[PDB]
Amino acid sequence: FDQRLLNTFLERLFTTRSFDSEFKLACKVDGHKDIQMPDGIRREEFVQWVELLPDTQTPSWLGLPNNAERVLLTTQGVDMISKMLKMQ
């Protein structure tokens, strides 16, 4: 099933459609908007596009459900509480 998931990403991304002006790298990241295939043809334009990526990254960027990080984030926040209390 990991092989099937890897094949799904490869067939979704490596296609002639990737050279289209409306290609979607990710779909419905927050229910409404989607990540757009940059229209540039030079490396500099692609690098700029990465720099303008919003900091609001969610697991839906990866095709995962948005709640997959909820348990991980809560545990990390409690750990950050613990680390402070360990150095007081």
Binding site: F1, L5, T8, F9, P65, N67
Partner: protein, 192 residues
């Protein structure tokens, strides 16, 4: 070990998630033994016929994958067919509204992850887990018709670690959901 709440190595026989306390294991072990008592109770009182008609918890079985092979072999013997000629059909229904036919076996404790099952049809969900009331496994002769372009093959693991693969299940997706989205969201079934 017990004083440090460490599961003794002499007790760990069946497959267990690495992170399990002796307390959790004792509760899990008690549930497994209770189920084994009922299985032996039916076997002694009734014989093999009761063993076929009793619902089983795949989590409580020490080797759940062997039960699937046993049910596969049982149907093959009753119909004089080969194992490789039998494909597994899954029907999810309420325990009260369930009827077990010759090839049907009842399984309880199966939990769907990231999806809900409604009228034997899968839909993407924002809930972490969904408890399947009663899963019926049917072994029928293979028709080598491939898939209906709306069927996903969900892995069934033993526990949340997804380390041991028990078997696979074919489900029909609902509406116009993309089967690829099911693969990307990690939708699977857990035995416990």
């Amino acid at each position: 070990e017990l004083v440090k709440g460490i599961l003794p190595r002499s007790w760990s026989h069946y497959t267990v998630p690495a992170g399990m306390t002796v307390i959790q294991w004792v509760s899990d072990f008690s549930e497994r033994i209770k189920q084994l008592q009922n299985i032996s109770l039916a076997a002694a009182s009734g014989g093999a016929k009761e063993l076929k008609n009793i619902h089983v918890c795949l989590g409580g079985l020490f080797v759940p994958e062997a039960y699937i092979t046993a049910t596969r072999q049982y149907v093959a013997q009753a119909n004089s067919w080969s194992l490789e000629e039998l494909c597994l059909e899954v029907n999810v229904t309420t325990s009260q509204g369930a009827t077990l036919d010759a090839c049907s076996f009842g399984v309880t404790g199966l939990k769907l992850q990231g999806a809900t099952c409604n009228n034997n049809k899968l839909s993407l969900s924002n809930a972490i887990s969904t408890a399947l009331p009663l899963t019926q496994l049917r072994w029928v002769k293979q028709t080598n018709t491939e898939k209906k372009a709306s069927v996903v093959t969900l892995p069934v693991y033993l526990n949340f670690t997804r380390a041991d693969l028990i078997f696979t299940v074919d489900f029909e997706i609902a509406t116009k959901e993309d089967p690829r989205s099911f693969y990307e969201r990690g939708v699977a079934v857990l035995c416990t």
